[PDB]
Amino acid sequence: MVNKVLVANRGEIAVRIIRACKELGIPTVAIYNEVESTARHVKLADEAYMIGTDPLDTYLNKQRIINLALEVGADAIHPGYGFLAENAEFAKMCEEAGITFIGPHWKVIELMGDKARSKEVMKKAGVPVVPGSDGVLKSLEEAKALAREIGYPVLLKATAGGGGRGIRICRNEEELVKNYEQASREAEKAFGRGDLLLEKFIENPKHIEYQVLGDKHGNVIHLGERDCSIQRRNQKLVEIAPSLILTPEKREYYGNIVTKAAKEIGYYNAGTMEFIADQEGNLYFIEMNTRIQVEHPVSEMVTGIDIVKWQIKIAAGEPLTIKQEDVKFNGYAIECRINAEDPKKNFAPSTRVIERYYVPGGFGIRVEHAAARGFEVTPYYDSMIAKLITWAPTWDEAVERMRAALETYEITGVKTTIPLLINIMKEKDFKAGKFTTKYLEEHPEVFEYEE
Amino acid sequence: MVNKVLVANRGEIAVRIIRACKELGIPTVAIYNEVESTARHVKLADEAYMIGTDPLDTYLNKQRIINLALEVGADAIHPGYGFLAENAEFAKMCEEAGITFIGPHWKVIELMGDKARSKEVMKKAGVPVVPGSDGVLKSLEEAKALAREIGYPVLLKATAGGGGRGIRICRNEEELVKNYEQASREAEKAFGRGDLLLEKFIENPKHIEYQVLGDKHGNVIHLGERDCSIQRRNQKLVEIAPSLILTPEKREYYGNIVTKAAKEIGYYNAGTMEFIADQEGNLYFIEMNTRIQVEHPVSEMVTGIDIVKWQIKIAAGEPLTIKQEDVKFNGYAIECRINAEDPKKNFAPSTRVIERYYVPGGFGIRVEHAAARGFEVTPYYDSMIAKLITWAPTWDEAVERMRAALETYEITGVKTTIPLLINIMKEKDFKAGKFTTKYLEEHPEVFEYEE
């Protein structure tokens, strides 16, 4: 039941959610801290309340938020991403209070919140995971036999005792033997067990993730994958959809594995299953975000499906009227994160105020933001200013569209990632579609720019 | 031959053209008057020159512009719309100077510039026009016979002598007889001929227009129609694509008539054939704009074809690699003109400066603009601030998307058409898809708003 939606978030995502609601004709309620009394979502909402005793408490106080919703007759809550989005407890409290939490079941959020345990659940559901030892290694002979079937290179690491805890890469059996002896040697001197584990080494991995969407009636579909390999400090900077490594047959092969596993755990509403891909295009499950994804727009661009609006319809009890066969993938979409940070000083945040601000627009261009002149980047929340997304029929056209949009995006008063992004779009390998999670490290040249 | 493009325009269209060029990797050259030294296109162009002795002379001085292009090695000129866009002379001068005019042949621009004569050319090409008398009426008997075959109501009007020149509506033969006698009576008293003409009366007409696009190799296709009935002072305010009155079969029927006629006159590059439609959906040709259309974006949204980029590729001599059968129409797109004007005081322009300015964005939202804080509306050019376009699978969803976007579009410092637009989106008939060129006159209620 959804008649009034309280957005338990802020920034660009709060705006995204509010727009979906306005389109559905659903009144909205915004919350905020005094430090953002002039924020965009506050102005766009039908109702808006300043709550909290500190910037973070505003969005993390479970009971106050539930009480407010109840106070103003808001029978549904959209957590967006981050904050209380994947808080199984909050989701449970909402249910008990009669409020519709716009997301998966709290039990599912709980299950998936346990990364090691969820990996076991997914594995048993038929989802591929990185192969390795079934617990501690029994001996060197077992390690040598295990390595042969999973294939080199492999990783050896001690998980107990006072011996060295650094991971050891073994590229052939000789290295394995030497690393195993050195490791057990260090454990003995510390009078204990090393509890050595072995795992397949997925080198120069790509971050490939699948978008999941299901209604509360058993229909669960996937909206293809996204390649979010280009990060820094594990912080995403550029994302694309679909990926360039999966063929249509493999896209569906992993896609069906994804939806089969999702159905098995009773998952509904929006979700993302994150994998790591090797040079050959093989995927291995890592974890699942049980919430809307920051980079969801690229998938929307190539499938033409409004994910956030569907989140609300599904939470309302509506049936997902899209069959897997109806999910098509047209062209490519790229998303660049426009953050107030200095990539040269290792992305330190520019907590200042935006002066000049011009947003690019045109054919194939989409902008997700809450900024304008006066926009301020406080030290309390993320440094995101906007999310620029471009769509085109082919990879190279999408790259050129993005660069052209970035080159016309004026922002002053703060340093941003725009110069960096522009260089990436011009970089030889990225243009050729060649990149892994270590792309930036491998291209220090993209950080060289007038400034 | 196109290696460097000089944009002989300004405002939002100059930005649109520059973006297309940047995407193609073509350097650009901008021109401007001192009064707009901080305009957007000036900043976005690779080269920019302040020229002219007055605001209009900047864009209308044919020889100075040709000379500059030659001076900086610009072998192509894009006129955008308005100004020198449909100046057959300028187009001719460009050719003679060895510059590629991005538009149809100058002879074609000349031909079509003669509205009465072009209507005769199109008629002979098989294009339907409003039926009427073949010159002056010979007698009352001929008028009565002519009216029966073209169908009532009809229009009678004197075109010579010192008699009354007002048009006379005749809804049946009796009215025709009485109007004919009164008209000839007035002519006799003035000692001369009335040169009475009769024409079919297309009452409560819709403005339906077809988008044309052809290469210099004989392939000419149409990109469907647009309904631009919602105007004021004949000034467009809201445009949609495709229209709601034509069925797919009629869409193609008129479409093929359009492309057949276009090919017959040797038309290439972008063009628009404007018609008026009656209550039954029958079209009658009025005139043709031999240039890019202001409202071209809605057609781009529903066909997925980049018209401006194609203008450049075609001018370069490239073949239009799109067959008519490949032209599909998906969903609906609406475009609202955000102008600095007061609709309550009969759209008087607000020649001031924009203070707060927030551009909406999201799924299905496109913005064409050159504005930002500081943007100024001088009294020399149009009052357009931006063009907001929304796309959705169905008519009602597109309407709601537009209203939601408009409600989130903040602009202060000047009065705009936003409040007016919002009311139209909420209006019962517009929502139902019922509207003609006299929509505003028939709905004074949309002008009632807080202010």
Q: What is the DSSP string of B238-276?
A: EEEES-SS--HHHHHHHHHHHHHHHHHTT--EEEEEEEE
- Using DSSP's 3-state secondary structure scheme, residue B324 falls into helix
Q: Is the Cβ pair B368, A361 closer than 8 Å? A: yes
User: What is the Cβ-side half-sphere exposure of residue A217, based on CA atoms within 13 angstroms?
Assistant: 10
Burial annotation A334-349 (CB, 10 A radius, 16+ → b, else e)? bbbbbbbbbbeeebeb
Of A300, A364, A373, the CB nearest to B363: A300
Tell me A125's DSSP state: T
Of A306, A397, A404, the CB nearest to B22: A404
> How many other CB atoms are there within 10 angstroms of residue B136's CB atom?
15
**Cβ–Cβ under 8 Å, residues A381 and A375:** no
B337-356 residues touching A, CB cutoff 8 A: 356
Q: Is the Cβ pair B22, A407 closer than 8 Å? A: yes
Of A23, A363, A365, the CB nearest to B400: A23
Q: Is the Cβ pair A368, B362 closer than 8 Å? A: yes
Tokens 């802020």 — which residue?
A10
Pairwise CA distance, residues B145 & B407, whole Å: 54
Pairwise CA distance, residues B186 & B189, whole Å: 5
**Cβ–Cβ under 8 Å, residues A227 and A207:** yes
Burial annotation B89-119 (CB, 10 A radius, 16+ → b, else e)? ebbbbbeeeebbbbbbbbebbbbbeeeeebb
- End-to-end CA distance of chain B, in Å? 53
Query: How many A-B residue pairs are in contact by the CB < 8 A criterion?
Result: 90
Pairwise CA distance, residues B39 & B186, whole Å: 56
CA torsion sign for B34, B38, B41, B47 is: positive
Pairwise CA distance, residues B321 & B215, whole Å: 9
**Cβ–Cβ under 8 Å, residues A276 and A207:** yes
Q: Which amino acid is located at B5 in the chain?
A: V
Residue of A nearest to B22 (CA): A404
Q: Please, what are the domains in chain A?
A: 1-129 (3.40.50.20), 130-201 (3.30.1490.20), 202-451 (3.30.470.20)
Alpha helix stretches (DSSP H) within A27-74: 40-44, 57-60, 62-71
What does R_g of chain A's alpha carbons equal in angstroms?
23
Torsion-angle region of B71 (φ positive above 0: left; ψ -120 to 50: alpha; else: beta): alpha
- CA A209 to each of CA A13, A101, A277, B246, B249: distance values in angstroms, whole numbers, following the listed order: 20, 24, 9, 43, 43
Pairwise CA distance, residues A424 & A396, whole Å: 13
Pairwise CA distance, residues A292 & B382, whole Å: 43
- For residue A367, which residues of chain B lie inside 8 Å, CB to CB? 359, 361, 367
**Cβ–Cβ under 8 Å, residues A103 and A17:** no
- For residue B426, which residues of chain A lie inside 8 Å, CB to CB? none
Burial of A227 (0-12, 13-18, 19+ CB in 10 A): buried
Pairwise CA distance, residues A422 & B441, whole Å: 50
Q: Is B97 on the interface with A (CB under 8 A)?
A: no
SS3 for B87-113 is CHHHHHHHHHCCCEECCCCHHHHHHHH
Q: Is B426 on the interface with A (CB under 8 A)?
A: no
Could you write out the DSSP letters of every residue in B287-302?
EEE-S--TTHHHHHHH
Pairwise CA distance, residues B44 & A408, whole Å: 6
Of A120, A117, A138, A140, which Cα lies nearest the Cα of A129? A120
Note if A291 is an active site residue. yes
Could you give the angle at the alpha carbon of B326 between the alpha carbons of B320 and B329, nearest 5°?
A: 115
Torsion-angle region of B235 (φ positive above 0: left; ψ -120 to 50: alpha; else: beta): beta
Pairwise CA distance, residues A80 & A366, whole Å: 19
Q: Is the Cβ pair B363, A25 closer than 8 Å? A: no
- Choose the catalytic residue: B10, B168, B291, B337: B291
Pairwise CA distance, residues A307 & A312, whole Å: 9
Q: Is the Cβ pair A366, B365 closer than 8 Å? A: yes
Q: Which amino acid is located at A400 in the chain?
A: E
